[PDB]
Each structure stands twice: as structure tokens, then as C-alpha cells.
Amino acid sequence: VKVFDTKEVQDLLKAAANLNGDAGNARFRQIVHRLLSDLFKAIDDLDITPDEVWAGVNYLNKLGQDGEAALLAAGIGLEKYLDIRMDAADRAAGLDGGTPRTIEGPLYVAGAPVRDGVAKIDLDDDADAGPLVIRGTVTGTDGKPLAGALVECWHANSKGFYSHFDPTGAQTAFNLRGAVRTDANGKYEFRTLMPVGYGCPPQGATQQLLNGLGRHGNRPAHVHFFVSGDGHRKLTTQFNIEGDPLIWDDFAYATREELIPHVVDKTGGAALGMKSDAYKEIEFDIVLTPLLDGRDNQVVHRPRASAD
Amino acid sequence: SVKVFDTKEVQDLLKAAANLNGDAGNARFRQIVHRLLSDLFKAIDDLDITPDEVWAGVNYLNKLGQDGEAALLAAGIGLEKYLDIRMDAADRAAGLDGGTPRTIEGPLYVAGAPVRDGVAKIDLDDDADAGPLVIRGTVTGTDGKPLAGALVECWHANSKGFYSHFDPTGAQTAFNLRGAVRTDANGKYEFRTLMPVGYGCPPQGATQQLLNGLGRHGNRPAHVHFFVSGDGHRKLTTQFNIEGDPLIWDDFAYATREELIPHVVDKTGGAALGMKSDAYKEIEFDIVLTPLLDGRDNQVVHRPRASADA
Numbered sequence: 001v002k003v004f005d006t007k008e009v010q011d012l013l014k015a016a017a018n019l020n021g022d023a024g025n026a027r028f029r030q031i032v033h034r035l036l037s038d039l040f041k042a043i044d045d046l047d048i049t050p051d052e053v054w055a056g057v058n059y060l061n062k063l064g065q066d067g068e069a070a071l072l073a074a075g076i077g078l079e080k081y082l083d084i085r086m087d088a089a090d091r092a093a094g095l096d097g098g099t100p101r102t103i104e105g106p107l108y109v110a111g112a113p114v115r116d117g118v119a120k121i122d123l124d125d126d127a128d129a130g131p132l133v134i135r136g137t138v139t140g141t142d143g144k145p146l147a148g149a150l151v152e153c154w155h156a157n158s159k160g161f162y163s164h165f166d167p168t169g170a171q172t173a174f175n176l177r178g179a180v181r182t183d184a185n186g187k188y189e190f191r192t193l194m195p196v197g198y199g200c201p202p203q204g205a206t207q208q209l210l211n212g213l214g215r216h217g218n219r220p221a222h223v224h225f226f227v228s229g230d231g232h233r234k235l236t237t238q239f240n241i242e243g244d245p246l247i248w249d250d251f252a253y254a255t256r257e258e259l260i261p262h263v264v265d266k267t268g269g270a271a272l273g274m275k276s277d278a279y280k281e282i283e284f285d286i287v288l289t290p291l292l293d294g295r296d297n298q299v300v301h302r303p304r305a306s307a308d
Numbered sequence: 309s310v311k312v313f314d315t316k317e318v319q320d321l322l323k324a325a326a327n328l329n330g331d332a333g334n335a336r337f338r339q340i341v342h343r344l345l346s347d348l349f350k351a352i353d354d355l356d357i358t359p360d361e362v363w364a365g366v367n368y369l370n371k372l373g374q375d376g377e378a379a380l381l382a383a384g385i386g387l388e389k390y391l392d393i394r395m396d397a398a399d400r401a402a403g404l405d406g407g408t409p410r411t412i413e414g415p416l417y418v419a420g421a422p423v424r425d426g427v428a429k430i431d432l433d434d435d436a437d438a439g440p441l442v443i444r445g446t447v448t449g450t451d452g453k454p455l456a457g458a459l460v461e462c463w464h465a466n467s468k469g470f471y472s473h474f475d476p477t478g479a480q481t482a483f484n485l486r487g488a489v490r491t492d493a494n495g496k497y498e499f500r501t502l503m504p505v506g507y508g509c510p511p512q513g514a515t516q517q518l519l520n521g522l523g524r525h526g527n528r529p530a531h532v533h534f535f536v537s538g539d540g541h542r543k544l545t546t547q548f549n550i551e552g553d554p555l556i557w558d559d560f561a562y563a564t565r566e567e568l569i570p571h572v573v574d575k576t577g578g579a580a581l582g583m584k585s586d587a588y589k590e591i592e593f594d595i596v597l598t599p600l601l602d603g604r605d606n607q608v609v610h611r612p613r614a615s616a617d618a
């Protein structure tokens with residue numbers, strides 16, 4: 001049957017969203033009515049059965065019980081879609097020359113201590129991960145170095161786990177997470193260990209849905225960044241470790257070709273405090289976009305973990 | 309505001325995310341996911357829903373599932389009623405619309421209640437504020453013949469609006485106000501119980517949070533739930549509402565139907581029937597079941613349901 005266009009259904013939708021109610025949150029009612037109407041129309045068009053609907057309802061219970069709604073947002077491409085819309089706005093405004101944005105992901109932790117110029121961020125030993133220096137210069141789109149800019153990074157250990165999200169045992173707070181204020185020449189440096197990619201929690205809601213679709217839930221190795229500075233917008237970006245076999249098959253659709261720097265083999269590591277003489281270096285320069293009339297039209301406020 | 313939805317980049321992303329071009333798999337599931345994702349992406353584009361708004365919605369889904377309330381929200385935003393609208397439309401087209409009207413199950417059924425022949429007393433815990441209630445009727449098929457050995461199940465709330473197995477103030481006895489009766493040889497069933505009161509959503513929960521955002525209340529008028537089943541017939545999900553409740557036509561879950569508001573009768577002689585006062589109320593609630601079409605029930609619903617041991 002097809003009932004969506006009937007007066008009874010359209011009246012039910014108006015009542016459910018309270019469109020005819022006292023002055024209230026008009027924007028919220030507008031969004032709820034649109035999403036509910038679309039859901040009801042999809043049920044009608046695809047003849048989605050009650051059994052199917054209740055399985056979807058049960059899935060939402062599991063998704064929130066697992067705390068995975070934001071992981072699903074990444075895995076179904078919603079997070080990338082938000083970036084697509086932000087990129088389209090920037091393109092229409094005539095912006096070019098900044099380091100491309102990519103997705104934040106769900107694993108930022110606020111509160112990492114800020115160091116001047118250089119930070120050593122591997123606090124826990126990890127035998128299987130080799131030493132890695134990440135360094136670069138932050139500039140604006142006019143080419144000038146930005147001094148005192150804040151460069152923040154976070155990444156996984158050799159087992160694919162981040163501090164504050166490790167199910168095998170708590171890591172030291174802020175392991176593999178750091179923040180540096182750039183020096184007078186715009187330079188930042190992190191001394192860390194090499195990340196490995198990772199998958200979704202195998203018994204969790206995100207992987208359950210991916211299994212139903214026939215998709216994997218893995219990401220190639222990467223390092224996340226927030227970069228900010230006076231006069232400039234906040235950049236959310238990352239880079240990927242070159243040569244990872246999943247580099248162009250991220251389940252969260254985050255890879256971009258300008259964000260795959262070369263990895264160089266170096267010596268002299270002990271004098272830098274690294275755990276071996278031989279180490280890898282990645283030079284990742286970053287270009288920030290200026291504010292428009294003092295405003296940042298793309299900074300995102302979302303729930304984020306914190307720690308002391 | 310940009311419009312990106314109808315670009316190759318977005319359409320390719322949707323196809324990848326739903327794995328439409330993947331190897332042989334669950335085509336139906338992929339089709340549903342692609343449709344829902346596409347509609348969501350299009351709504352974000354059309355209403356210019358900001359990242360901050362999206363992440364607040366994602367956060368809400370986390371809270372909804374942490375609270376275990378997805379099925380309560382399904383009732384509160386009319387989705388559960390909508391499934392009934394579609395089932396009623398299918399019955400009308402098929403000529404299977406001759407039985408007692410259906411209404412929503414709600415999220416509080418519990419499997420495992422004791423079954424009695426003919427008559428069941430289901431108030432296991434005292435409730436000083438609720439008066440005695442007899443519910444009785446006869447189960448027939450659409451041809452009017454009584455159905456012997458049909459299973460009539462009911463469940464309802466206490467005077468505080470709480471159901472056994474879902475009472476946050478303290479555990480009720482297992483299966484308090486929940487029972488099942490096998491009809492007698494003449495189709496009769498009877499429950500002896502106490503009068504229910506209506507109830508609201510958990511005030512700090514996700515469902516009430518969304519309703520508050522819309523400006524809506526989350527209350528239900530007083531009611532009693534039923535499942536009725538029997539060999540050769542479809543399983544009925546229904547309820548009746550207590551006459552005179554001020555919220556009877558303002559249920560937050562949209563479940564009231566004019567055919568399901570029975571006359572309440574004042575009776576005396578309660579002590580002889582094991583009730584706690586001489587005066588009591590009786591509600592007659594007859595049931596007409598539809599015979600199976602082609603030997604299969606195509607409207608029975610499988611969904612997660614609680615269970616317990618008596």
C-alpha cells in the first residue's frame with residue numbers, strides 16, 4: 001500500500017513535530033518534521049515492514065549503548081559529507097591555497113599540555129612502533145610564517161589504539177597526543193612513534209552495520225591535526241602514512257592526495273631523545289586560511305572528550 | 309548556502325557507503341541504507357543543516373541508546389502509529405479489516421507470564437490507591453463463532469503509572485499486572501486486577517528531551533494492553549482506554565481509537581470474587597479475530613521484547 005500522501009499521515013506528521021504549536025524552537029521543529037516525513041515516505045516507498053523498522057529501532061539502542069553514533073557518522077560518509085559542503089562553500093568564495101581539510105574523527109581529547117616549539121608525545125613504551133619525527137612550518141596563504149600558532153596532533157599506537165580509548169588497558173593520559181606553539185619561524189615538531197591503522201570495535205554497532213553491508217571497518221595509518229592561529233581559521237586536517245595498503249580504501253573516506261607526505265629515513269635519533277639512532281621523519285607543512293572580517297565560518301563545536 | 313547533493317562526488321560517496329557496487333550481499337539492506345542516507349544528505353543540503361547541528365543530532369542518538377529509549381521515541385514521534393496506519397491500509401485492500409481494531413503494542417511487553425484457564429487474577433502486589441477492576445469478554449472469529457482455547461494476554465500499569473519489570477522506584481513482583489488466559493469452551497476470558505493510571509516518559513530521558521524541544525508533553529492516558537491469538541487466526545495487538553481520562557484524545561503516542569473506549573460499569577459483590585472492596589468496576593471487552601489468509605499471519609510483528617521467570 002501507499003499511504004504517505006493521505007491526510008491522516010500528513011496530520012500525524014504535523015502533530016508529531018508540533019508544527020501548529022505555541023511559539024517555540026521553529027528550527028528544531030522544521031528539522032524534525034523533515035526527517036520524520038522523509039522516514040515515513042521511505043518506509044512507504046520501499047515497503048519497509050514493521051519487523052525491519054523494529055530491527056532499526058533496536059540498532060539505534062545498541063548504537064548509543066556502544067557510544068558509537070559518531071563512529072557510524074564517519075563510517076557511512078556523513079562526516080566526509082560535511083567536509084564536502086564546507087569545501088564547496090570555500091570554493092564558491094574563491095579560496096584556494098590552504099592545506100585541505102579532512103575529517104576530525106571521534107577521538108580528539110581536549111586538554112593536552114602545550115609546549116614551545118617541540119613536544120615529545122610518546123609517554124608509553126611500544127616495542128612494535130618505531131620512532132617518528134613529525135615537523136613542519138605553518139604559514140598563511142600569503143606565504144608568511146605564523147609564529148605562536150597552535151599545532152595539535154593525536155594518533156594511534158602500534159595496536160591501533162588511542163589514549164583514552166584503549167580497551168586493553170588505560171594508557172598514560174595524553175599518550176600520543178600533543179600541542180606545540182610554533183616558533184618565530186613558524187616551526188613545530190613532534191617526537192613520537194609511528195602509528196598503525198585500526199578497525200572498528202568488532203562487536204560494536206558500527207561494525208555490525210558494516211558487516212551487513214559487506215564492508216570493512218578499517219582505516220589506514222594517519223595522524224590527526226588541529227591547527228590555529230591569530231588572524232586565521234581553525235584547520236582540521238590529517239596526513240596519511242604513505243604506502244599503507246588501505247590508504248585509498250579508508251572506511252571513513254578521509255584520504256586526500258595532498259595529505260600524503262614522503263617518509264624519510266634518518267640517523268642521529270639518540271641526540272633527539274629517540275629510542276634508536278635510526279628513525280623516520282615526515283615534513284608536513286601547513287597553510288592556514290585567513291579569517292573573513294574577523295570571523296571563522298567553519299569551526300565546529302561538537303562533544304569531545306577531555307582529561308587532566 | 310551551497311547545494312552539493314546532486315553532484316557526482318556526493319552520489320559516488322553514497323554508493324560507496326551503502327556498498328551498492330559491492331560483491332553479492334544483502335541487497336535489501338543495502339537498498340534501505342542507501343535510501344535513508346541519501347534522504348539524510350539531501351535534507352542536510354536543503355535545510356543547510358550545519359555541522360554543529362549534525363553533531364548535536366549524533367550526540368542525541370548516543371543518549372537515546374544509552375537510555376534504552378529508541379522504542380519509546382518511536383512511539384512518541386508517531387512512527388509506531390504509522391506502522392499501524394500501513395497495516396490497516398493493507399487489511400482494507402485485502403478484506404482483512406473485519407476484526408477488532410489494532411493499536412500500538414508499546415515497548416513494555418514481557419514474555420513468560422503465567423497462563424490460567426478462563427479466569428486470572430493478575431494483581432500480585434497491593435496498591436492502595438488503585439480500585440478493583442474486572443475485565444472480561446468473549447473471543448469470536450469474524451463469523452461470530454466462539455474461539456475456545458484462544459490466548460488472551462494483557463499488561464498494564466499500577467496507580468503510579470509503572471509496569472512490572474520497568475518500575476524505577478523499586479522492583480514489583482514478577483508479572484504484577486501481567487497475565488494470560490486460555491478462553492473457555494465458549495470463548496470467555498476474565499481478568500481480575502486493579503485500575504491502571506496513565507504515565508509519562510522518564511523526565512531526564514532522551515524521548516522527553518526531544519519532546520521538550522518540540523514543546524510537546526510525553527504523557528499517555530490510562531489503558532490496558534492486549535495480545536490475542538488462536539489457532540487458525542491472526543494475532544491481534546490492541547488496547548483499550550479508560551473512559552473519562554483527560555488525556556484520552558491527547559496521547560503522546562497517538563494510540564487512542566474510538567472503537568476501543570469501552571463502557572465502565574459500577575458493580576458490587578467484589579469480596580465474593582476475591583477483590584478488596586465490595587464496589588468494583590467491570591469493563592467488557594469482546595474480541596473478534598480474523599482467520600488466517602492462506603495459512604499465514606502476514607501482520608504479526610517480531611521485535612525485541614523483555615522476558616522473565618515467574
Ligand SMILES: [Ca+2]
Nearest residue numbers: 094095096097
Ligand atoms: Ca589564491
Ligand SMILES: [Ca+2]
Nearest residue numbers: 122123124125
Ligand atoms: Ca615514558
Ligand SMILES: [Ca+2]
Nearest residue numbers: 168169170171
Ligand atoms: Ca598497555
Ligand SMILES: [Ca+2]
Nearest residue numbers: 038041347350
Ligand atoms: Ca525526497
Ligand SMILES: [Ca+2]
Nearest residue numbers: 431432433434
Ligand atoms: Ca494483594
Ligand SMILES: [Ca+2]
Nearest residue numbers: 021022523524
Ligand atoms: Ca506550552
Ligand SMILES: [Ca+2]
Nearest residue numbers: 429581582583
Ligand atoms: Ca486468590
Ligand SMILES: [Fe+3]
Nearest residue numbers: 105107222224
Ligand atoms: Fe584516527
Ligand SMILES: [Fe+3]
Nearest residue numbers: 414416531533
Ligand atoms: Fe502502556
